[PDB]
Design a protein around this motif. Sequence first.
Motif: not given
Length: 217
Positions: A14, A35, A39, A45, A47-48, A86
């Motif tokens: 990310t 992350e 994917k 993909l 962003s966590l 997320s």
Amino acid sequence: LPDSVDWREKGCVTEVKYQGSCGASWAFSAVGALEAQLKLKTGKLVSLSAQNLVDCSTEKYGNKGCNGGFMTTAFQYIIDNKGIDSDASYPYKAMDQKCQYDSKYRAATCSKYTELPYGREDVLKEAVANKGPVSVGVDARHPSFFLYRSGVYYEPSCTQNVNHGVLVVGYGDLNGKEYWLVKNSWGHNFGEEGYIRMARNKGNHCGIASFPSYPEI
Ligand SMILES: Cn1c(=O)n(C2CCN(CCCn3ccnc(-c4ccc(Cl)c(CNC(=O)c5ccc(F)cc5)c4)c3=O)CC2)c2cc(Cl)ccc21
């Protein structure tokens, strides 16, 4: 086996984040590792939520939010908590809040994690290549680190006592100097568009292979 890898080429990394005055490198490193595993399995993909970890993976996991923590126990939280949100739905605020986790906005899950043997830069190379990005700790106490602009970082006064969560997203070499490709969480103006290349195979330089961990789904 491959002489160099870069997990950004494989679509598994990310945007570089900015942790700010909150010492949540551990959370950023942890979500970064997951992350990539997201994917690999899902194709997505996203962003966590670092903040989800800062807020919820707390006293039970030996983590003090903005005063530091462990990636290994952050993975345990995501296993125990049966998911993580997320970044979109639980965004980063650079301070310690009440745990506001909501199962609705779960974007990823974690089944287990693996802790690699101490100081073994060979085993780290295997994992980076064959498993994916590995969360690691480094000694980032020294001003050279803060100031790093480009090339392969080598700090003579660097110890193997780690204080800062980063994410190894590859490796390679430059003019003979072998490096680890490390994602930082100090904004885009740090190093090479947010990244730093740190010395590989030089006696566990700055503690990079001291405490490596990666999750699995
Ligand atoms: C309350 N309880 C707790 O504490 N454990 C720890 C977490 C798991 N193992 C860690 C040993 C491995 N090991 C050793 C030294 N160094 C790092 C390390 C790795 C990456 C980073 Cl980035 C850092 C930097 N972090 C900090 O400086 C920091 C600052 C404040 C803070 F609150 C936490 C960390 C350190 C490291 O992983 C054992 C101790 C618990 C474990 C269990 Cl079963 C039950 C309860 C626990």
